[PDB]
Amino acid sequence: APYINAAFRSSSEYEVYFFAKNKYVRLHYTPGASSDTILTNLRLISSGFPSLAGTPFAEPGIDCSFHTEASEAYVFSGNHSAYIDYAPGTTNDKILVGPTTIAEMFPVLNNTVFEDSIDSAFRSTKGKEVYLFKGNKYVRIAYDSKQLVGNIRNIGDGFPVLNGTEFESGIDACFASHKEPEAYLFKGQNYVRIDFTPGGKADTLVGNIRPILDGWPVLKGIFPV
Template identity: 30%
Template sequence: MVDAAYRIPGKNEYYIFAGRNYGRVRFTSNSHENSLVAGPTLIRKGWNTMSKVDFGRVDTVVPVPGTENQLYVFFGGRYIKIKLDNYDDSFVTDGVHHIESGWKSLVQAGFDTVDAAVLVPGTKNEIYFFRGLNYVRVDNATDKMARTVTPIKDGWPSIAKAGFDTVDAIVPSLNHEGHFYVFSGDQYAVIALDHNKEDTLVAASKLISDGWKSMDKWV
């Protein structure tokens, strides 16, 4: 399964995290063809920041809204804020932080850990967070819930139609603006999400190994 995915700004590439390993996957422009260009490598060996805070695995990676090449990385009940510069990672804020002290909105939502997250299209500061069967929309600038906690099956018809109860990772498509890959278990689907927060299923669920050849045998 894919634990987390991050689209690398300015490149046709993703970081994919699975178990204790990660890899860098490259897509051919305007194509679904993809290849593994780096890895799989142990997270502890390839990421300076994660090694320093003892992150052997990753639950969620999501860009920091309104910033360039900064991202939040969640593992268990903790998170770090880092910067990625030409594949080199460094801390934006020193050390590791706990969700319970750094994200009052997630605590209020009852999210002690995070399964997946994605920026909300058409907003400057909002993030969708997924945990178990539920999700919540959070304003990163104010650390407040922009919408109450809602079951995924009720708020995301595209994900429900794909047959997914939970979300392991969600990441924007490289080749289609407004399209997103959603991973759950050993499968993935493609959805469209517009600025009105309306979502539709673009491509039905299929095995990750069928659509992402680059992940074969290690995810």
């Protein structure tokens, strides 16, 4: 039971979506402060995103997601994917593409460890790049061309600061902060903050690791879900 199974940052400034099982919350956050606030109380994914009702993303829920551009995002559940427009503040949310399987959405992932499911992913600052994580492996993909960038690598090799930590063999969830170029990584009950610089994964800065319920105290008594 990882506390947070998926996360992606909103088109709304300093807002983020955290998913756990078939449910989610929408938070307003402030880097540097423990002052985070719930804007949308824990509820069914299908309630917050009606276009997802009757799909793997509603039940059992979203296990990986990343922000792309505008109010669009990629979501996953097992071996399934959808490109969606969540249209913040309106009844106009919709699936642009899918549901389809991961390999159908991204043929470059066919016959890889990513085909059957993806642990987590976050939006890079460079071009249209996105970091995908599955076990102890990661790879960058450009979401527009849908082509891979670089080789599939061990997290520990691509990110030496994460080598030896609990993130080395996997990342349960993560998202790109509105404060660039930072990201948050989540593993089990813990999380950490990073400062990354595209191309130079080796030059990643990492903070000390903390329990989720201490860094985001507002989730206390709500998470684990």
